[PDB]
């Protein structure tokens, strides 16, 4: 069923792995794809889900740089390590949802620069939250292998 | 007229005998066949409909007072018909509608020859989409350790069905329909099991072409095998010749006779009719019109579904 | 006809069951399990048997003869068999299952195949014939799921929408309405399509690695690591004895197969990898 | 100590109702428990005969009787053509269980002589006789058990398995 | 008789255990817990034989012999054992409670499933056939737990609402405040739904992450960071030890299972997370 | 026996104690602290043996094997360690 | 029936000759031929006492002694501190089988009545203690199977098993 779902890990990852200029980001995304795969499953989809924004400080020219990696492949990251690594898995979360067709990819991208939107995003994904953990298990498993993999330390 | 043999799982029909340990230092194995032998399929049925006022060492004047006549066996999946085709030790099961052109096929020119043939039994060929190898190993345990005994291993290659599939034979009976009519029967094997099916279906039974294919084993009558060996181009245009037992018998519980035989799938020209004939003799006639009741001389046209005989 | 009577029953895995295969499949398995012409797993007519006919033996060891007329006799006279076994057939894989509030809420729940089923049913018409204990309050309801054929079913339960095994989202039809359920656990069947099915069933089927230790320094030998392949607790096989006509087999149908309820099948017996219990679809129709 | 007996159910007469008496209490073997009838006894070896139907002691296994339990005394009219046995619960032959059972059964079975002055042949009766499942439940179904002829039965299940699951091998004499 | 004696026990865990990954399906822990099929912890019986026999064969190396009989030989084996381990069934699990009002007060409670004790009454009425063992005591109890079930129920004290793991709210019926404890212990026992069972257990489980530290800097290595998950202190699970006659079974079943009654299991001992007790059905009644 | 020393132990603060169990969803402290299976503070013996360790490591420099045999070896592990370690549990907390 | 004597193995004295009969025929039980020592007899739930070695009856399962059985008779000058009772040879918990046995004996094992004086507590003795299983092969290993010094001459293999095969529990009082 989810063959197609390596490969487009492999596509998210590359987006990822080049948004993130500064080595110390790379390094602070390794430990979001061991840890955050781990808590989905644990504390369950959304309750992670909320984690991950309250982390990742939305509201800026990153919450718009993430609608350009949606397409673009020269946008960039820019933030706190911390910041950037927490909204860059955001990312791999969002791009899994418009691929796939769980949520439609152009309310997600409208959402994400309307700020009256947002909540209905989030309230959109509370009713998703048992189908999304489903499917991602898969592609998020293999963001986390790749992570460990390609994210080395210098 | 029409029986279909519906196997319920997979089947063992094994050809070269000594299947059973007996050497100490060394594992036993068979194969099966694809196709079971018309004398696997005759006793079947023969047991069935057995009556014990008969035979007393006959196994076919016994066999073939119950039967009238049956035909050659080839396999329906779908209401599609898929026949034996044989070459140099290559057995395929190719569907009816590329038989129409192998005496044209088989005369091409080297190169051309060796392409069509080579796409026959390769690409054209489905009996791997229908047929798989259950290579099933087998062990027999001593009580006394509750491990496998000393070397009591054998391994069997069943026959596995991934489609549905069943055995096609035809009778000239009807007065046997209402018999042999949703029995389940233990069809030869390993004490496995298939089901019995009979319906009317209207084909041929004499025709006259230059080439038939082998539906079932052509019997060589062993007097005429030297001068059938020696130009064996004249008789058989592609298969394979072997000398085959013809089986086991039950109420005597022997091995029954071993006689070179035309393996079925095999392409015989029209000189094999005439020619064997005209080598057996009425001394031997009597038995082997017995060999044809039970459904071994039988042929078919590559025309259509045509079903000929020999000595019939 | 030489088989007057045909008893099916049900192979129910009371612990996990290994029936082994030697090394016949790839996928990464040492010991796998035995499969049949499609993948799923089966048991063999032969294992079956002989498990059955070692136990048994041992049970009663007073009708040691009527069990050697019906089951083979192993000695070196060879008397025919009276009785035959079919191959088990996988029937339902027990699934772990995550339902959108859809229900009354269940954690597990049983899965088919519409490929399962057909033989199932294949076995169900073949000995309709002969059984005139017509067990057509079975065979019927196979019929009506398999004319509902080309989507993911479910039997009684109404849930219209569950996760199979954390992997598989799957939305569920009812039959037409409702109908009642052949395994009397109040659980429900699952009858996924067979590219689906296949999916789910594989992922209920343990694949464990398996290691020897150093006693004396408590780490692994070299090459002491291997891998097998169990067929879960709950898990439900189906098979038929078939039996021909004679005086000993009245008594073993009558005398012999009333008392199995349990039996032990395949090995890793020290691992307690074999009680399974037997229900006899005779008394549960 | 408890006492029942064992009413088989033929396609034949002289077992309208031979029991001749009713729980007296409220405990018994067999059931209809709305998914059928439970515990059904079987009993191997034995014969019926057309004529005053009862069972006679065949000694071949393939012959078998199958009937009921109901909690009584025989007809208290001959009184000997009974053969009264104390057994324990897991002795008896027993189809589709559905409880247990108190391990102290008496049991009466309808008992005859074999009667050798013609030799033996049973023969397998199906008793589905479409006319006559209608007149058993009649003559036992509902004299053992009221509630049949009452608020709650399921006509396409226990009208039917009266002549599906109950068989016997009869003398045909 | 197919089974000379059968030996139900209990596993309460001393120390948080950790029997290792074993499966082969990818998982989000690094080094996960034993699963068993409904997704429950377990301690597969080739993990239960493997400690038990080493640790046997280290406390009686005068009866080496006996032990090999029951339990197997090592290097070249001529026969096969004897005894056989059964898959340990969760039992219990112990769940911290904060309970609304009664009075008396709790810290923490056992928090059993309807799933679970099912499973071990496949257990007691499989084993109850297959030997001279009728284990009615504890049939009679889970027997009467069965007949209550989906419905959340607390077995003797008076709770009738509790908070779960900090986040499952209960409501709980009294089953009949005179049926005796399961075990010897003054902490009630609570049988969930199977579904709320679920999420609660999955809470009572301790995700672990470790780290390996680079001695010349203090700091975690390169990708020196793993996580790990442990079975809680308290946990109960339920498993059968079986064995035919051989006058080694008689032996074993007399000196070394009355002398059984700690053994390490599991992995991650250097850090003490094997220590188990052992309590016989026999004495615990 | 089955272990040939069995030495407990207390383990008392001299200053504040703090092993991590690492930040996480459900927890609302930043870094909080290993807690128990039933909520109070715990030390899981990982960081016990692990701090020991490192700690004899460099106290007695010249007992490296006898350290490596009881604790485990560090750069190729070809056994098992001799010793091991119970998880600290809390036994009395100032108030 | 025939008879056998259980003489048990210790590091001890007393025991260095005892049957005062030898096989008288060509039977035994316990045998040593190229290849160990088999059928060694284990008798449980009983302690040797080194004064006076012979079994004492105490209940503990996992006090044993594991010893070897000849075929004779006591050394009728006790006659009476002898365990005397006839066995299937199934019964009889035996080591390092070689075949099926006769399957009625009668077995001789040296008893004491346990004189309940001071209480028992006994220890598990090994026999490793080279000196002594040098010198056992001659006091009882030879004059029993005299052709441990003839025919299967490979003391080290016999030497060797009787440390390993042989152990038991003592009162060590």
Redesign the interface.
Known sequence: ??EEDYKLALEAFKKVFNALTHYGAKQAF?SRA?DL???????GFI??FF?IISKAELNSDSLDSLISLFSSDNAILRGSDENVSYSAYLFIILYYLIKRGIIEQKFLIQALRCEKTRLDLIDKLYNLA??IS??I??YL?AI?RLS?ALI??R | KRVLIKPLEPLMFRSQGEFEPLITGSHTAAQSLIIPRPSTIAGMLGYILFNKSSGTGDWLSDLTNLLATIYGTFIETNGEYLFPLRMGNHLALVDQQHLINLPTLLEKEYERREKGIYELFYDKNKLFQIINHQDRIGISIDKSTRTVKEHYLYSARYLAFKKEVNYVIFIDNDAISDKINGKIVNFGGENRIAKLEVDDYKVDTSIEEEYYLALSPILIPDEALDNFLDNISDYVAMGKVDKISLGFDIANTKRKEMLTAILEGSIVKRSIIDFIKNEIKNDLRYRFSKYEKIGYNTLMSLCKLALRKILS | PYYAFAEPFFIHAITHLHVGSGSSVEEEIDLPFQRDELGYPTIYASSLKGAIKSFLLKEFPDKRDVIYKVLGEDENPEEASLGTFLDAILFAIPSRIIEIDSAKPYVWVYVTTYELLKKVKLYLDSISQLSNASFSNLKNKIDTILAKEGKNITLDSDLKSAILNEDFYVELEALNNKIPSIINAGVPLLVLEDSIGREVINRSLIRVRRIRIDRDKKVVETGGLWSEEYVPMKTIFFSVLLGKESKESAIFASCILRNLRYVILGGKETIGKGIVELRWVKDVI | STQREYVFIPITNSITIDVKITIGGSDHITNIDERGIHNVLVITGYAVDEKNGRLVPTLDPCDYVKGILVAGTPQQAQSNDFLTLKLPANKLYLIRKKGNISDDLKIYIPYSSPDARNSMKTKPVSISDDTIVNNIIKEVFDKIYNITQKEKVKIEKVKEDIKELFSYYALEQ
Request: aromatic share 12%.
């Open positions: 069923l989810y390794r061991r795969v781990e808590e989905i499953y644990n504390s309750p992670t984690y048992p189908i489903a499917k298990r898969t498993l986390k460990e080395e330390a």
